[PDB]
Structure formats: structure tokens, C-alpha cells
Design a binder for this molecule. Structure first.
Ligand code: MET
Length: 531
């Protein structure tokens, strides 16, 4: 199936300003998208904002402002932040969009016509802040904003409230067996593996039916009305999840503005998502509810859901009220955009709750980006070493030459598999393992001495080094999109050879290609003061 590769981030609540969690999720989405574009594939990468619900409307009220104005402003803060982060996302969706509402109504009607929605009751706990229904086993005792006894979510720690309401219910219980068939038949469909096992164990135990509407009053009328019943509003999560379907059906103009909603998803060849990127906090919605809605509606299911962990800073929770902030724009202005991206993607795997510190950030910047990558680029482009400023024609390869060539040839296959899991950390580590071997080869060969001693031998060492740098940089370009261009410029790699699987091959750039011009004080990654 040749198709548009469709990758998504969650759409974020607009109750507060964007922070590291949103930036991270969208980064991962962006990297996956970029990698597939460099493979030469059609890509549609989607992100946005989740703007309805009690959470958002009550946040708007605290600030004493209309929900229309509040959501528009905060959505604007998200757009600005992502523009500043220099992502390459194809569309930013908002759930207040009029075409999104039409798609939600359409999906609801499908579910209803399928016979999977009935009028019932929910009587139980609810976390407004997570917009999540909870069983008694998922709450415990805690303290409220006044310091008084209350109940709180075991999963999030936020305050829970008891809801008793006549609600439209989705027959989620009837999808147990089909969901288990889906997990078993596609054992790569949830990453990482231990989260897949978590989902299966939960669904094995049994699923209750799910409330998919609420009384309009309790939502402060900030939601999508239920088709055919104006007293009810659609559950914010059914509304939210549907953004993936809406996005798959929007034709977007050059300005990034939506201009048209197609009737059928096949028209645009995006749906279903190849990868949904999410935080672990919202796994049940994506791995249980969403596929259940899709099965009911007769829509195809996503290929992969990847769920990552939560960041801390200096081994403590990130929080403004606690005095431990982590502003990614600020840190990117301080250490560099590509460098911060690298750190976030290298420091932690999706299994882990990563930790940022300035100490570790500086260590990775100095050790990997500067000492390993940058130093190598300067060596093979130095006029002291590469005296003719060009890709030389290699002479015969020794066994040591060939062991390195083999590593370079194997790298694209290895990195590719890792990018497709996806496991971005392992893709990076694999590339840097090859960079370290190129460095050690260079140190071993001492090309600087070969200038005087054996110019022929130098041609060989230089060519292998240049090509190793080109291939590694190509595979890092989704992670260091700005710096990869600087490197290719320095190497004089023609535009055409900067993407496409043809250029994963060793030897794509011919001997005789000239290096890019030099600039006196130019430095690729400047080391930062250790303190
Ligand atoms: C359909 S993804 C919705 C995610 C939700 N708005 C959140 O921030 O957790």
C-alpha cells in the first residue's frame, strides 16, 4: 500500500501555556515525519489543540474571559511556540474548527446507526483535569487546593468528583474480543512493549461501557452538541480523538490554512495513522477507546501507537509553583535548537522518564556533538588535511579501510529499522557508534602526517572519512535539520544527494566534488563552559 505516511501528535488542552511535554511530543512527531520525507515518501504530520470541555472552560472562567477568546489566545501561544521550535508540521488543527465539528457529528451518527450508542447512566468518579472516568480502585485520599480532605486520581493526583448523570453510552464492553484479536495480530502496534502488555492485561480483565455525552450545563455549553439531542454534548475525548480523522480529510493551502473537507478519507490517502505519538498518560484513550470507535464505525485502525514518558528537571518535578521551570525555547536560545532536540531525543528512551540538567546537557553537547561530530567534520574539510578542498579519488582499500566501510554500509538498514519501531534513541546511538569508529580510524591513520608522507594513502583515508560523515549526517538530518545542512554545505554535497534512499548508499557523491567555501571563525558546535 503506497500511501501518505501519516504521523500525529496528541492535540493539547489549552488550559495553560505550552511547556516541555507538548514540545517533546510534537518533536517526536516531527522527527518521524522528517525521516520519512528524507526517504522520499509523502508525509502528513499533524499536531494541534484540544479546546473544548469543562477543564478548558473552567480555566477560561478563572481568567474571567470568554472561552472563544481564551482558546484562541492560548492556541496562538502553541502555534508561536512550535514555529519558534522550527518544526516541519503540515497542519495545526483546532477542535473549535467548523469542519472538525462536522466530522465528529458524522462519526457519532455512524456509531449510533451501528447500534453501539444507547441512553444510559454514569454514576462514578471523574477527573475533570484528565477528563477521565475512574473506578474506585483508581482513586485514593488526598488534599485539595484549600488543604481539605478529598479524593484524587491514583494515576494523576488531580482532584476527582462524583458524577451521576443520564449520559449516552458507547458499548465498549462489546469490543473486548475484537480488541484482543487486534493486539495479538499486530504485536508491534503499541510501543514500547511493556505498555502493550499493560493494555492487553487491562482489556483482558473486562471493559465497562463508556459515557460519550454529558449534560450540557456541566460543560458550561463549551462542547459539540450531540446530533439529535441538544441537551447533551459530545464527550471531549470522542471529540478530541476524531481530530486524527478530520486532519486526514483536510486539504491545506500553502499558508497552512485549511481550505476544504473531503467526504471520504481515501481521497487524501492519509487515514489511518501510521504512527500516533502520545504520552503514557493518554494510552487508554488511544489503545482502547479509539480503536473501539473505529471498529464500530468500520474505519481502519492505526498501525502504531508510541507512548513516551514524562520529563523531570534535576531529578525533581517540573513546576512553576514549585520553582523548577524548564523552558525549552529558553534552553534552545542558550544551547542551540538542534542541540536541545538532540539532547531530548538522545537522553531518554520512550520506556523512560527522562531527566534534564544543564550539566548533562553540556556533557552531551561537548562530548557527542562537538568532540565527536563537529571535530570530525572539521578534520575532513580542513585545508591543512584536505589540501585540494575536494572529495578525493580513493586508492586501494586495506582491511581496516574495509571494516569501516562495512560499518557505514550497514548503518542505513540499522537506523531505518530503529526509526520504524519507532525508537529514536537507538537510531541516534547507532549513528554515533559509527561516528566514533570513523574518529578512531582517523586517529589511527593520522591523515595530517600523510599529507607529507603518503599523498596516495591520504586520498583513501579522506574519501572514506568524507563519505562516513555524509551518510551519518543524512541519517541524523531528522534530528539536526539545521546543522545537517551546514555540514552538507561544508562537504559540498549537492542538493539532490541530501535525500532519497538512493543516497543511503556508500559512494553516492563522486570523487572530484568540491567542498563548500570556508569561513574564518566558523564552528559547527562550540563547546560550553563546564561548571
Ligand atoms: C486526541 S489527543 C488529546 C490529548 C489531551 N488534550 C491531553 O492534553 O492530554
Amino acid at each position: 500500500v503506497e500511501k501518505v505516511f501519516f504521523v500525529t501528535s496528541p492535540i493539547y488542552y489549552v488550559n495553560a501555556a505550552p511547556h516541555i511535554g507538548h514540545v517533546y511530543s510534537t518533536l517526536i512527531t516531527d522527527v518521524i515525519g522528517r525521516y520519512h520525507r528524507v526517504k522520499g515518501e509523502r508525509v502528513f504530520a499533524l499536531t494541534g489543540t484540544d479546546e473544548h470541555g469543562q477543564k478548558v472552560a473552567e480555566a477560561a472562567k478563572q481568567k474571567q474571559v470568554s472561552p472563544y477568546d481564551f482558546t484562541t489566545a492560548v492556541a496562538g501561544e502553541f502555534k508561536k511556540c512550535f514555529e519558534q521550535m522550527d518544526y516541519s508540521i503540515d497542519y495545526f488543527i483546532r477542535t473549535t474548527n467548523e469542519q472538525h465539528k462536522a466530522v465528529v457529528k458524522e462519526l457519532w451518527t455512524k456509531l449510533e446507526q451501528k447500534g453501539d450508542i444507547y441512553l444510559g447512566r454514569y454514576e462514578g468518579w471523574y477527573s475533570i483535569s484528565d477528563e477521565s472516568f475512574l473506578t474506585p480502585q483508581n482513586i485514593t485520599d488526598g488534599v485539595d487546593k484549600d488543604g481539605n480532605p478529598c479524593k484524587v486520581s491514583l494515576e494523576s493526583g488531580h482532584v476527582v468528583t462524583w458524577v451521576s448523570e443520564e449520559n449516552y453510552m458507547f458499548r465498549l464492553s462489546a469490543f473486548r474480543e475484537r480488541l484482543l484479536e487486534w493486539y495479538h495480530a499486530n504485536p508491534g502496534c503499541i510501543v514500547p512493549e511493556f505498555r502493550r502488555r499493560e493494555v492487553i492485561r487491562a482489556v483482558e480483565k473486562g471493559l465497562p461501557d463508556l459515557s460519550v455525552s454529558r449534560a450540557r450545563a456541566t460543560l458550561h455549553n463549551w462542547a459539540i452538541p450531540v446530533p439529535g439531542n441538544p441537551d447533551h454534548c459530545v464527550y471531549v475525548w470522542l471529540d478530541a480523538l476524531t481530530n486524527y480523522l478530520t486532519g486526514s480529510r483536510l486539504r491545506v493551502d500553502e499558508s497552512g490554512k485549511e481550505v476544504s473537507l473531503v467526504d471520504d478519507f481515501n481521497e487524501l490517502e492519509r487515514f489511518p495513522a501510521d504512527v500516533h505519538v502520545i504520552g503514557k498518560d493518554i494510552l487508554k484513550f488511544h489503545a482502547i477507546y479509539w480503536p473501539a470507535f473505529l471498529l464500530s464505525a468500520g474505519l481502519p485502525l492505526p498501525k502504531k501507537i508510541v507512548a513516551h514518558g514524562w520529563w523531570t528537571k534535576d531529578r525533581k518535578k517540573i513546576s512553576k509553583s514549585l520553582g523548577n521551570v524548564f523552558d525549552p525555547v529558553e534552553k534552545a536560545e542558550e544551547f542551540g535548537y538542534d542541540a536541545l532536540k538532540y539532547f531530548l531525543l538522545r537522553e531518554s528512551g520512550f520506556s523512560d522518564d527522562g531527566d534534564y540538567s544543564d550539566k548533562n546537557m553540556i556533557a552531551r553537547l561537548n562530548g557527542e556533538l562537538a568532540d565527536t561530530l563537529g571535530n570530525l567534520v572539521m578534520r575532513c574539510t580542513s585545508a591543512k588535511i584536505n589540501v585540494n578542498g575536494e572529495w578525493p579519488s580513493p586508492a586501494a582499500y586495506t582491511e581496516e579501510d574495509e571494516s569501516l566501510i562495512q560499518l557505514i554500509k550497514d548503518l542505513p538498514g540499522t537506523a531505518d529499522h530503529y526509526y520504524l519501531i519507532p525508537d529514536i534513541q537507538k537510531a541516534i546511538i547507532a549513528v554515533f557508534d559509527v561516528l566514533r569508529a570513523i574518529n578512531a580510524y582517523v586517529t589511527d591513520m593520522a591523515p595530517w602526517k600523510l599529507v607529507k608522507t603518503d599523498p596516495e594513502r591520504l586520498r583513501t583515508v579522506l574519501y572514506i572519512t568524507l563519505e562516513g560523515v555524509r551518510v551519518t549526517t543524512l541519517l541524523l538530518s531528522p534530528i539536526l535539520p539545521r546543522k545537517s545542512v551546514v555540514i552538507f554545505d561544508m562537504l559540498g554535497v549537492p542538493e539532490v544527494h541530501r535525500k532519497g534512499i538512493e543516497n543511503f548508499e556508500f559512494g553516492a557523491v563522486p570523487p572530484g566534488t568540491r567542498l563548500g567555501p570556508a569561513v574564518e571563525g566558523e564552528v559547527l558546535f562550540s563547546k560550553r563552559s563546564t561548571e
